[PDB]
Design a protein around this ligand. Structure first.
Ligand SMILES: OC[C@H]1O[C@@H](n2c[nH+]c3cncnc32)[C@H](O)[C@@H]1O
Ligand SMILES: [Zn+2]
Length: 349
């Protein structure tokens, strides 16, 4: 009994955070790379988390499996492909998947991620591989999928390249640029590489989303919006702590990419306090309900819907409304955007 058994739109999910334990297991064995377990079940209990940790502590879960995927062409395309499939089954009609092309490369990247031996999978090659998998997947499960390339807070040296990859693969799945990573890295929002990359995104008409305010303060959100010119705020829960800023974002109709389950599991949200999404729903704000990293949170899109339904009083009417807003707030070109809205309204009848 799903919380909302109707078409959905997801704008916030990490491809490298939405991998099948069976695929991880498969490639570790296949490449002879170690994993903290050799059973999907125990693989899930190590990578997985059922209790709040922290953002820095949550991010380390990737260390367990990224090494078996990164640098492997077969694996990069496969996870991209199986991702669409996972989305198709969850009832998602349109989705934007994000990831760092750099963290999956083993050539032309410095610092080499995961202590990898050089190879031929360049960062560009990664975008191409994911595009291919995503495309083959759309085709096969019939849902529309786009992608978003992440700048990493800790590695601004990579940012300007990410912008280039967005320019090159514009709408050839790549519809936007994100800034992900450890939001606690003081000043990461302001590092030159990042700033210069967004400045060029603005100048070259490349869409922009920025993770901010999940654990950072209103100023991190203020900087994303004002300095980085972000078009959407990834999560942004802490924005409501600055009534003035909140109201100005509410006025611009800023889209907040919300991830309920994720906010609890990363300790971003104090379970004793009311979720910022309650305030969002109440203020009729522009916001989507997203999954973020389902492999690590051991969840599905329904997990976040059941959470809001059961615990936050969300109705089918709010569910329909938030998704219509997610559609309007997507980085799809006008025509495809209209086509998306058309489908949702058709099905919401
Ligand atoms: O998917 C791109 C990267 O964004 C980061 N990311 C994933 N889930 C996240 C939640 N919050 C902040 N950053 C996240 C991860 O380091 C992942 O490797
Ligand atoms: Zn995220």
């Amino acid at each position: 009994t799903p919380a909302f058994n109707k078409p959905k739109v997801e704008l916030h999910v990490h491809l490298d955070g939405a991998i099948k334990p069976e695929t991880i297991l498969y490639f570790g064995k296949k490449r002879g790379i170690a994993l903290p377990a050799d059973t999907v079940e125990e693989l899930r209990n190590i990578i997985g988390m059922d209790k709040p940790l922290s953002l820095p502590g949550f991010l380390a879960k990737f260390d367990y499996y990224m090494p078996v995927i990164a640098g492997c062409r077969e694996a990069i395309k496969r996870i991209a492909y199986e991702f669409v499939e996972m989305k198709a089954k969850e009832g998602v009609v349109y989705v934007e998947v994000r990831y760092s092309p750099h963290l999956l490369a083993n050539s032309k990247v410095d610092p080499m991620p995961w202590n990898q031996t050089e190879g031929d999978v360049t960062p560009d090659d990664v975008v191409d591989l994911v595009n291919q998998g995503l495309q083959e997947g759309e085709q096969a499960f019939g849902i529309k999928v786009r992608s978003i390339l992440c700048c990493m807070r800790h590695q601004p040296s990579w940012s300007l390249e990410v912008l280039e990859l967005c320019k090159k693969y514009n709408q050839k799945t790549v519809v936007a640029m994100d800034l992900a990573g450890d939001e606690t890295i003081e000043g990461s929002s302001l590092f030159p590489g990042h700033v210069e990359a967004y400045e060029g995104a603005v100048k070259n008409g490349i869409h922009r989303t920025v993770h901010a305010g999940e654990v950072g303060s209103p100023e991190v959100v203020r900087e994303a919006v004002d300095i980085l010119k972000t078009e959407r705020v990834g999560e942004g829960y802490h924005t409501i702590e600055d009534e003035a800023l909140y109201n100005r974002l509410l006025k611009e109709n800023m889209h907040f990419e919300v991830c309920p389950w994720s906010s609890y599991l990363t300790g971003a949200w104090d379970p004793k306090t009311t979720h910022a999404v309650v305030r969002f729903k109440n203020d009729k704000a522009n916001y989507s309900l997203n999954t973020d990293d389902p492999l690590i949170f051991k969840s599905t899109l329904d997990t976040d819907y059941q959470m809001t339904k059961k615990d936050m009083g969300f109705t089918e009417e709010e569910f329909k409304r938030l998704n219509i807003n997610a559609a309007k707030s997507s980085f799809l070109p006008e025509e495809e955007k209209k086509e998306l809205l058309e489908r949702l309204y058709r099905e919401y009848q």
